[PDB]
Structure 1
Amino acid sequence: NPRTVKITASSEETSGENAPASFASDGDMNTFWHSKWSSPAHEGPHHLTLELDNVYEINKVKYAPRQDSKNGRITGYKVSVSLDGENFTEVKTGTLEDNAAIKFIEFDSVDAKYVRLDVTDSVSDQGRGKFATAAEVNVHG
């Protein structure tokens, strides 16, 4: 029910491959957002912010890792909510297992128009923290 109308990111890759932030919001597990890795690489801090079409009561973020590589797989996160897009309130901080499984970050119900996923840690095939990727990210109530 919470519907993402817009997604913005710290950075995105569109030169070395086509991996824009919108690819984290397109319902397709075969497309991923990637932080900019082509020179000059953006090495963080990485984040993804979802703008919803209304204020929703939310209690879960789904984070589906890219399925073809561990590059940018998020292992450390903060989730924050906002009504205006500038003033955020942290609702959850934690770690995520280093595997390709869809992750479900759960917290007490809270109103949000914007949901920001800040990366505090990530892994790579090779590395830590340099990249961030997501096949899909969305929010649920």
Structure 2
Amino acid sequence: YKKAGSEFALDSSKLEAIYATSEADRDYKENAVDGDENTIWHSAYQAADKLPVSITIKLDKAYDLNQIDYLPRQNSRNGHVTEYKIETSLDNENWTEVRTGNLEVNEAGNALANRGYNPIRFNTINAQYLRFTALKTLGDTNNKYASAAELVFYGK
């Protein structure tokens, strides 16, 4: 039987990545919301690159949103987000801060506790744009670059 809430997951074709602070290689912003667990967005990792970095997703219409799931890159820890901010907008110009938060880490504070989908819930807000910002991340250099395999959105 279904997980409470799962019927409200939006198809990934409804999510367009319209902005990211930077990108590396072929790890395009669009890959954070292409419904493919195997493709990632990864921000750039040259000397002047640093956190924070953001990625902005446009939905096909406004929704009443109350959750996104963050899926970490599945075959490497580089860019795993550990602290994030969520903002939303109706017009891609006036932003509301909807939450900041942390994803759980291990005892050492150097690896994610949950390698799968990490739920990020917030009070329902009508929005057509959501900006996800990586404030802290893990990697072979920590707190420098972010990645995301998927951002799954829930709304009505």
Q: Tell me the TM-score normalised to structure 1 length.
A: 0.89
Which residues in structure 2 correspond to 1:11-90 (within 5 Å)?
Answer: 11-14=22-25, 18-37=26-45, 39=46, 42-90=49-97
- 1:114 and 2:129 are equivalent in the alignment: yes
1:136 to 150, 153, 156: 150
Could you list the runs of 5+ residues in structure 2 that have no partner in the other structure? 1-9, 105-111
CA deviation vs aligned residue, 1:90-129 (integer Å, no higher than 9, x gap): 11111002242211100111101100111111011x3221
Conserved? CA contact 1:10–1:44, under 8 Å: no
For 1:28, give the aligned amino acid: D
**Higher-Rg member (1/2):** 2
Which residues in structure 2 correspond to 1:93-104 (within 5 Å)?
Answer: 93-97=100-104, 98-99=112-113, 100-104=115-119
Moved runs in structure 1, 4+ residues, more than 6 A?
none
Conserved? CA contact 2:51–2:135, under 8 Å: no
For 1:133, give the aligned amino acid: S
Residue 75 of structure 1: SS of its match in structure 2? Answer: strand
Conserved? CA contact 2:38–2:74, under 8 Å: yes
Residue 143 of structure 2: SS of its match in structure 1? Answer: coil
Structure-2 separation of matches of 1:132 and 1:118 = 9
Higher helix share: 2
Higher strand share: 1
1:10 to 21, 37, 40: 21
**Which range moved further: 69-78 or 1-10?**
1-10
C-alpha RMSD of matched pairs (Å)? 1.5
Could you list the runs of 5+ residues in structure 1 that have no partner in the other structure? none
